Design an enzyme around this catalytic site. Structure first.
Site, PDB file in Angstrom:
ATOM      1  N   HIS A   1       0.845  -1.205   0.000  1.00  0.00           N
ATOM      2  CA  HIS A   1       0.000   0.000   0.000  1.00  0.00           C
ATOM      3  C   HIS A   1       0.871   1.243   0.000  1.00  0.00           C
ATOM      4  CE1 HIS A   1      -2.433   3.014   2.236  1.00  0.00           C
ATOM      5  NE2 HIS A   1      -3.487   2.292   1.886  1.00  0.00           N
TER       6      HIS A   1
ATOM      7  N   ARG B   1      -2.741  13.329   4.368  1.00  0.00           N
ATOM      8  CA  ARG B   1      -3.493  12.141   4.776  1.00  0.00           C
ATOM      9  C   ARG B   1      -3.576  12.068   6.304  1.00  0.00           C
ATOM     10  NH1 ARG B   1       0.040   8.597   6.938  1.00  0.00           N
ATOM     11  NH2 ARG B   1      -1.458   6.861   6.921  1.00  0.00           N
TER      12      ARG B   1
ATOM     13  N   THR C   1     -18.164   8.273  -0.578  1.00  0.00           N
ATOM     14  CA  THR C   1     -16.901   8.957  -0.824  1.00  0.00           C
ATOM     15  C   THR C   1     -17.251  10.447  -0.697  1.00  0.00           C
ATOM     16  OG1 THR C   1     -15.977   7.264  -2.318  1.00  0.00           O
ATOM     17  CG2 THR C   1     -15.129   9.476  -2.530  1.00  0.00           C
TER      18      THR C   1
HETATM   19  C1  HEM Z   1      -1.617   9.633   0.240  1.00  0.00           C
HETATM   20  C2  HEM Z   1      -0.680   8.713   0.241  1.00  0.00           C
HETATM   21  C3  HEM Z   1      -0.857   7.566   1.140  1.00  0.00           C
HETATM   22  C4  HEM Z   1       0.150   7.065   1.899  1.00  0.00           C
HETATM   23  C5  HEM Z   1       1.582   7.542   1.860  1.00  0.00           C
HETATM   24  C6  HEM Z   1      -0.385   6.064   2.719  1.00  0.00           C
HETATM   25  C7  HEM Z   1       0.395   5.427   3.674  1.00  0.00           C
HETATM   26  C8  HEM Z   1      -0.162   4.586   4.618  1.00  0.00           C
HETATM   27  C9  HEM Z   1       0.581   3.990   5.650  1.00  0.00           C
HETATM   28  C10 HEM Z   1       2.055   4.228   5.904  1.00  0.00           C
HETATM   29  C11 HEM Z   1      -0.286   3.250   6.387  1.00  0.00           C
HETATM   30  C12 HEM Z   1      -0.020   2.379   7.582  1.00  0.00           C
HETATM   31  C13 HEM Z   1      -0.308   3.025   8.918  1.00  0.00           C
HETATM   32  C14 HEM Z   1       0.017   2.113  10.107  1.00  0.00           C
HETATM   33  O1  HEM Z   1       1.086   1.506  10.133  1.00  0.00           O
HETATM   34  O2  HEM Z   1      -0.772   1.946  11.084  1.00  0.00           O
HETATM   35  C15 HEM Z   1      -1.577   3.404   5.806  1.00  0.00           C
HETATM   36  C16 HEM Z   1      -2.710   2.786   6.272  1.00  0.00           C
HETATM   37  C17 HEM Z   1      -3.944   2.950   5.626  1.00  0.00           C
HETATM   38  N1  HEM Z   1      -4.217   3.616   4.507  1.00  0.00           N
HETATM   39 FE1  HEM Z   1      -2.981   4.730   3.479  1.00  0.00          FE
HETATM   40  N2  HEM Z   1      -1.705   5.951   2.449  1.00  0.00           N
HETATM   41  C18 HEM Z   1      -2.079   6.837   1.545  1.00  0.00           C
HETATM   42  C19 HEM Z   1      -3.288   6.992   0.934  1.00  0.00           C
HETATM   43  C20 HEM Z   1      -4.397   6.261   1.242  1.00  0.00           C
HETATM   44  C21 HEM Z   1      -5.645   6.374   0.583  1.00  0.00           C
HETATM   45  C22 HEM Z   1      -5.998   7.261  -0.578  1.00  0.00           C
HETATM   46  C23 HEM Z   1      -6.515   5.507   1.211  1.00  0.00           C
HETATM   47  C24 HEM Z   1      -7.916   5.387   0.724  1.00  0.00           C
HETATM   48  C25 HEM Z   1      -8.830   4.561   1.104  1.00  0.00           C
HETATM   49  C26 HEM Z   1      -5.789   4.872   2.288  1.00  0.00           C
HETATM   50  C27 HEM Z   1      -6.267   3.982   3.199  1.00  0.00           C
HETATM   51  C28 HEM Z   1      -5.519   3.452   4.245  1.00  0.00           C
HETATM   52  C29 HEM Z   1      -6.150   2.623   5.264  1.00  0.00           C
HETATM   53  C30 HEM Z   1      -7.583   2.181   5.298  1.00  0.00           C
HETATM   54  C31 HEM Z   1      -5.148   2.258   6.127  1.00  0.00           C
HETATM   55  C32 HEM Z   1      -5.216   1.343   7.342  1.00  0.00           C
HETATM   56  C33 HEM Z   1      -4.840  -0.044   6.865  1.00  0.00           C
HETATM   57  C34 HEM Z   1      -4.838  -1.111   7.969  1.00  0.00           C
HETATM   58  O3  HEM Z   1      -4.520  -0.861   9.163  1.00  0.00           O
HETATM   59  O4  HEM Z   1      -5.261  -2.279   7.642  1.00  0.00           O
HETATM   60  N3  HEM Z   1      -4.507   5.352   2.256  1.00  0.00           N
HETATM   61  N4  HEM Z   1      -1.472   4.222   4.704  1.00  0.00           N
END
Ligand code: HEM
Ligand code: HEM
Ligand code: HEM
Ligand code: HEM
Ligand code: HEM
Lengths: 242, 242, 245, 242, 242
Positions: free
Chosen positions: A163, A176, A224
């Site tokens: 991701h 974010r 959304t």
């Molecule tokens: C904008 C750039 C993005 C980056 C750099 C990014 C990065 C990350 C990172 C590093 C995590 C992990 C957090 C943790 O360790 O607890 C995360 C979790 C998550 N991100 Fe993103 N993300 C981005 C965009 C998005 C977008 C557009 C969505 C749209 C639905 C999204 C949905 C999620 C969700 C739902 C989680 C939680 C996943 C889990 O715990 O199972 N992210 N993201």
């Protein structure tokens, strides 16, 4: 206190998101009544500034779910409710119907921490937003299936690294913020974004659609929520014909 | 006077849960009609005190499904109905739209009984709530798929043992109560929780998401009802601008 | 005079936002006094004119051709916020004030992802040379599309093959159907908004049948819902029709 | 003048089930209009007594789908419609919104006939309700998937024998009546139950959840209509504040 | 120009089906206004007689989706719209909320033609309707899954032969008409039926549930519209209390 920068950047803070439609008979109110609304909205936010912070966004015309969005943070969940109770008593509030209302809690990194995934964590920490000031908000509720949760911590970490790898590039033009909601709402997460570049945002989401984590989503929107960032004065005046 | 402690702690008690939205024209009523609402509410609760007990909770601002929740118990299901018919006749009642209304019965332990699973049964009887007084309520309707019910008594026991193992530790800070609803509502169970610590509650539900029982859920929320515990007087006054 | 927005350019270049909104007219609109309903048409033209340097607006009547709405607006701009601002002003008109929004989806026009000259040169040639030759379109169709995770998890080549198969049997309909694609992932609960204009609904039914039969269709989780069907109308005619004028 | 007993026990009879919510502005009506409602209800029932029978039930407070249920039988489906058209012209009817309305026909046994399943047919035939008079009604719409209907006659017989085996015992305290609806409604069946014992009813439904027939259900409730048996006079007065 | 016999029996005709609920405040109008409604309805049908034909049916009390149904045919789709626009401007129209509205086109036979399936095609004529005049209408929207459409012409023909086989015997008591809707509505087909014998119709649909074509239906109703055939005068008078 309550300090905006602290509430927006620390774990253990509750985020309360609520969307509303303005009822049809609001604009039938006399002009004088609608003129007074914007000050009353700014004052109710000020009244609660010891306990919550409040952001306002205009969603009318960018989706069918709502006319506006409120984002409210506090370390006390009930304080967020108290604010919303008093909002609903304002003149605009009184003529608003709630269409969605989801709450969650900010948490430390579960996956992409320095200890678990140092390289990606380094890239996450050093990234800097460098585009013009955001103009748009997007809120996406997310819920993952039982199969996701039943995978091991290691399997899940791999999928979250996947991701993260292609999305770090978007930290130059998309802000974010993640909230955790399982048990508190019909969602596992609430995700919150600010950008000025919706073309980039569409590309970002497409990049996430294409990774195996996405096969586990049972909610990824619905709604959304798309809006424009507005001050409370401007938001209330817009919806009040002022 | 019906016996509250007994109605809350014995098998064979009907639990009747109902959520309502306050109609937009309630707050348009003359102040006198709204000021009278609180006493009407206490009089109807008092009228039925021989047969039912009633708890009230404020859900406005913590979810879009409702503004308040009633939890009503009796050994006679029709007596819960008679109470809610009289509630709907009160002024608040008259201006409330019912959004969900589920009933169920309390039962003996099916799985984690002394006879079937003694170690975890002692773990359960063991446990004690040690945190400050609960501030929040969560109600989660649950329904399991046909595949679940078609598993053997032993296969289901095993998965309920696995449900129980990670959750026993949360009895320090979450109170729970189970009702059974198959054939009485579109749910197999209603689950009811009180806590002061919604961070802990989020973690509890995550733990349960991760077990194989969860692959069988077709309803697990929808709605997830989150509220604050309030006296009837405070609930009704809050929603009446009093 | 500042210059008006350039309609033909907005309809044909990448990076334009398309905003689609459908509305039901509330029951009490027709209970308004006649003079109020009679003024509604001018109010509609003035708000369109007020926004003419930043947006373009198309109107369509959907009442009687579906249960989802009574009218559709299609608004384009290079600035998403300007589509919003027009729609905010629209809602302040007498007809807008009595309109309940039933769907509102936005998307962005993009360069070809699949049937480009580099990636699929024969089909691209067929796409680029096709010309609509029927009488002027009378109908609009809008179909929101969303594809499942399995689609998006397929490789670039696997997706291209399926979009080549989408294209092969549909080229022939470019003589009597006009199409336009918008991309919506992240901006709405859809991946795409598809827009069609035609005079021949028999042909359009056959076109969609042809697409139902291809493997791509196994991946749709939304393909309509709503399928918005309407007639192309001027703003004046649309508003007078819905106002009993 | 329609023969109740025969209409309730013979094949080829149409059963018409409808549920309604009472509109928020009914109780805002002058007391004298609500006072006449009950006589209006009796007169319409009498008006149609040559062609239909009518049963009334109070569902308010036992579910969110409705406030009351009407069950109407005739050999002529159109006569059931004509009654309900007239019901809707009464004062209470005029202030009622229909929320569900399903029809079906009573049929001879398809499966557990003396010829096909003699041992279970004998238990079915000899079973006798022995409890106090029913107080509650349950209506469960049922729809089975294409895989069910695509099974052979013998495969389906086997599963209906499995349905019947563990449920015969509940005939002592649950009355059942089956209606067939495929093509007439978005259901294959309408099931109708009367009982005084909802605890027994819950256990009955649990037993049927456990059998392989249940893997084929695509509707099995939605709504599950739970109510109390009432006379028409009591029902109308209760909903009229009389 | 519009000729009823021909519009009902030739390919290339658009069929437009719409269902409506009568708003609760229609019966609050003065008696004189409701008395005038039937004539207005008849005159709007007359106004459009050169382009469309119109059939009316009463659905109140036979389902919850509507109170009446309109079936409108024209060789010009926009003409069917023009008629419905003018209908909505009539007194009854102004107090009607549309609940479903589907269009499609009549087509030559795709599968059971003389060239492709001569025996079954001849068989379409082996009985004629012989029962009392139809009293009831049923409309069933149908949508088939992608897997259906992805099967070959030959595979699908075999399945439609299997559909037609059991159906022939209901030609004595059910009239049918098929419309094609893919790309025009959220359905692939609209099916329309007239009968006097709802027991037969139930059996017909059961026979169709049992064939493999049914495994491909994602819509087969929802709504299943059931009504009584009525003249426009009788329909409008019934709904007007006249
Ligand atoms: C904008 C750039 C993005 C980056 C750099 C990014 C990065 C990350 C990172 C590093 C995590 C992990 C957090 C943790 O360790 O607890 C995360 C979790 C998550 N991100 Fe993103 N993300 C981005 C965009 C998005 C977008 C557009 C969505 C749209 C639905 C999204 C949905 C999620 C969700 C739902 C989680 C939680 C996943 C889990 O715990 O199972 N992210 N993201
Ligand atoms: C707070 C700590 C929790 C503990 C200690 C706990 C413990 C238990 C126990 C011992 C049972 C078995 C009852 C029996 O033998 O009949 C049970 C059943 C159940 N629990 Fe929990 N639980 C907790 C939280 C939750 C939560 C948060 C949910 C949320 C959905 C939940 C849902 C259920 C359901 C639906 C059942 C019935 C299972 C069945 O009969 O198939 N529990 N729980
Ligand atoms: C009228 C004749 C049609 C032609 C010639 C046609 C052709 C095409 C072409 C060439 C593309 C690829 C664009 C790209 O490379 O980025 C495409 C994409 C698409 N078409 Fe069509 N199309 C037609 C009708 C339709 C219809 C009727 C629908 C919907 C029912 C539809 C839905 C789409 C969608 C959703 C996409 C985007 C696919 C993706 O990116 O995954 N098309 N079409
Ligand atoms: C109270 C004890 C019950 C008994 C003894 C019982 C017995 C039966 C029997 C003998 C039949 C077959 C009728 C025939 O041959 O045509 C049947 C059918 C059926 N029962 Fe029950 N039943 C009971 C309770 C229930 C309940 C609570 C439901 C709720 C869902 C249910 C749903 C049905 C349905 C849907 C059918 C029709 C099945 C089909 O034709 O495929 N029954 N039942
Ligand atoms: C009453 C007796 C019936 C007869 C004689 C009959 C006969 C047929 C025939 C001959 C066709 C093929 C048309 C063609 O070749 O293009 C057909 C198609 C169809 N029938 Fe029936 N049918 C009857 C009842 C029904 C019912 C009750 C339904 C729905 C519940 C139904 C749904 C359909 C559908 C959706 C199609 C289109 C199939 C497709 O093109 O994939 N029919 N029917």
């Amino acid at each position: 206190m309550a300090d905006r920068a602290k509430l927006l950047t620390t774990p253990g803070v509750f985020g309360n998101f609520s969307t509303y439609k303005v009822r049809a008979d609001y604009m039938k109110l006399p002009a004088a009544e609608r003129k007074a609304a914007a000050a009353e909205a700014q004052m109710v936010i000020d009244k609660h500034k010891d306990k919550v912070i409040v952001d306002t966004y205009l969603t009318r015309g960018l989706g069918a779910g709502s006319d506006y969005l409120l984002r409210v943070h506090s370390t006390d969940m009930a304080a967020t409710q108290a604010f919303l109770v008093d909002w609903r008593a304002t003149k605009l509030g009184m003529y608003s119907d709630v269409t969605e209302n989801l709450v969650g809690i900010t948490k430390a990194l579960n996956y992409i921490s320095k200890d678990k995934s140092p390289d990606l964590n380094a890239g996450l920490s050093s990234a800097t937003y460098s585009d013009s000031a955001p103009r748009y908000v997007i809120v996406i509720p997310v819920k993952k299936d039982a199969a996701w949760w039943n995978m091991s911590d290691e399997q899940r970490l791999k999928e979250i690294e996947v991701h993260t790898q292609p999305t770090l590039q978007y930290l130059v033009n998309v802000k974010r913020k993640l909230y955790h909601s399982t048990g508190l709402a019909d969602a596992d997460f609430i995700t919150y974004f600010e950008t000025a570049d919706l073309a980039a945002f569409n590309n970002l989401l497409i990049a996430l659609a294409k990774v195996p984590e996405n096969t586990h989503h049972v909610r990824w929107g619905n709604p959304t929520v798309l809006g424009t960032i507005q001050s409370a004065d401007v938001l209330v005046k817009t919806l009040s014909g002022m």
